[PDB]
């Protein structure tokens, strides 16, 4: 196997811009950690560079056409190699970015989405996912507050 995508989405499915997203959402990061801990995480090189260090308590797998540059994580050159590096686990987590999501979404059975009520002009988007193919099985809404800069709604969808 089961492959899942986990992503934080601004308005219009924006997930990235030139620099870090202009928001502060510790609740989202706690949700991300709770749902990825003890699972392998696959990420593209740009997402790796934006996180800046290995995610603890998870097998970190970086996709890049070029040789690796950090021995604390696993480096792979193809989608199939990334999957192979995960071994036989109950669930593989794909954590970004847009180019990686595009290639893994067809193979995915589960989406963990955080919908953030932030209007951000950004060049990178989460790929189209049709409701015909994806059934919402969990939803939890939260207002912005002293710790979280925008309102956010957690959602899990499973492939119909």
Ligand X SMILES: Nc1ccc(C(=O)N[C@@H](CCC(=O)O)C(=O)O)cc1
Integer CA distances (angstroms), 158 to 50, 80, 90, 96, 108, in order: 28, 22, 15, 18, 9
Question: In angstroms, how far is CA 21 from the centroid of its own chain?
Answer: 14
- Find out whether 53 is annotated in a ligand binding site: yes
- Which lies closer to ligand Nc1ccnc(N)n1 via its Cβ, residue 22 or residue 132? 22
Smallest separation (angstroms) from ligand X to the CB of 18 = 15
Integer CA distances (angstroms), 145 to 26, 113, 114, 141, 142, in order: 11, 20, 16, 13, 9
3-state helix, strand, coil in the chain (%, to 5): 25, 30, 45
Residue 83 binds which of ligand NAP, ligand Nc1ccnc(N)n1, ligand X, none (CB < 5-8 A, kind-dependent):
none
- Interaction between residue 136 and ligand NAP (CB under 6 A): no
Residue 28 binds which of ligand Nc1ccnc(N)n1, ligand NAP, ligand X, none (CB < 5-8 A, kind-dependent):
ligand Nc1ccnc(N)n1
Integer CA distances (angstroms), 27 to 96, 114, 127, 129, 151, in order: 19, 10, 24, 24, 10
- Find out whether 38 is annotated in a ligand binding site: no
Residue 33 binds which of ligand Nc1ccnc(N)n1, ligand X, ligand NAP, none (CB < 5-8 A, kind-dependent):
ligand X
Residue 63 binds which of ligand NAP, ligand Nc1ccnc(N)n1, ligand X, none (CB < 5-8 A, kind-dependent):
ligand NAP
Smallest separation (angstroms) from ligand Nc1ccnc(N)n1 to the CB of 16 = 10
- Interaction between residue 9 and ligand NAP (CB under 6 A): no
Contact 131, 82 (CB under 8 A): no
């Amino acid at each position: 196997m089961m492959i899942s995508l986990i992503a934080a989405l601004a308005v219009d499915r924006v997930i990235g811009m030139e620099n870090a997203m202009p928001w502060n959402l510790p609740a989202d990061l706690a949700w991300f950690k709770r749902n990825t801990l003890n699972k392998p995480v696959i990420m593209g090189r740009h997402t790796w560079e934006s996180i800046g260090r290995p995610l603890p308590g998870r097998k970190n797998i970086i996709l890049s056409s070029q040789p690796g540059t950090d021995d604390r994580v696993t480096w792979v050159k193809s989608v199939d190699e990334a999957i192979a590096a995960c071994g036989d686990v109950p669930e593989i987590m794909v954590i970004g970015g847009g180019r990686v999501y595009e290639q893994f979404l067809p193979k995915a059975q589960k989406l963990y989405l955080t919908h953030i009520d932030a209007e951000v002009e950004g060049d990178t988007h989460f790929p189209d996912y049709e409701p015909d193919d994806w059934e919402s099985v969990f939803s939890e809404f939260h207002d912005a507050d002293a710790q979280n800069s925008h309102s956010y709604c957690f959602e899990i969808l499973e492939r119909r």
